[PDB]
Amino acid sequence: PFFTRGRTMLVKLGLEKYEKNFKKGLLTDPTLPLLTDSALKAANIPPGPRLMILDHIQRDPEIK
Ligand SMILES: [Cl-]
């Protein structure tokens, strides 16, 4: 599976520690535009980082 775009976002946000969480929950690159707070919660990502991720998806034009 492709996790490279998700990695790029996390590095940009200083949240690379959650690469594992994405891989574990199968939050592959095609899921990036679809990410929800519930999905990230199921991936064991704490509240703060959830906000930064969901805000990045809403703003980055390179997120399909
Ligand atoms: Cl929580």
Author numbering: 194 to 257
What does the paper say about this structure?
Named Tric1 and Tric2 (tRNA import component 1 and tRNA import component 2), these almost identical proteins belong to the preprotein and amino acid transporters (PRAT) family of proteins but are distinct from other PRATs in that they also contain a C-terminal SAM (sterile-alpha-motif) domain. The mitochondrial outer membrane proteins, Tric1 and Tric2, contain a C-terminal SAM domain that is required for the efficient uptake of tRNA into plant mitochondria. In Arabidopsis Tric1 and Tric2 SAM domains have been shown to bind tRNAala via key lysine residues at positions 205 and 210 and are required for tRNA import into the mitochondria in vivo. The protein adopts a characteristic fold consisting of a 5-alpha-helical bundle.
The Aps235Ala mutant would eliminate the salt bridge interaction between the carboxylate group of Asp235 and the side chains of Lys234 and Arg243 of a neighboring monomer. The crystal structure of the Tric1 SAM Asp235Ala mutant was determined and refined to 2.07 Å resolution revealing an identical fold and lattice packing to that of the wild-type (WT) protein. As expected, the salt bridge interaction between position 235 and Lys234 and Arg243 is absent; hydrogen bond interactions are still present between the main chain oxygen of Gly218 of monomer A and the main chain nitrogen of Gly241 of monomer B. Additionally, the mutant adopted an identical super helical structure to that observed for the Tric1 SAM domain. The Asp235Ala mutant eluted from the S75 as a series of different sized oligomers and monomeric protein. None of these displayed the same thermal stability as the WT protein, suggesting this mutation has severely crippled the ability of the protein to form a stable, discrete oligomeric species in solution. No mobility shift bands were observed for the Tric1 SAM variants Asp235Ala, Gly241Glu, or the double variant Asp235Ala:Gly241Glu suggesting the abolishment of the tRNA-binding capacity. EMSA assays, carried out using Asp235Ala and Gly241Glu mutants, reveal, in both cases, abolished RNA binding capability. This suggests that the oligomerization ability of the SAM domain is required for tRNA binding, and that removal of the salt bridge between adjacent SAM domains can also alter RNA binding ability. Furthermore, the hexameric oligomer was observed in the crystal structure of the WT and Asp235Ala SAM domains, albeit slightly offset in order to form a helix.
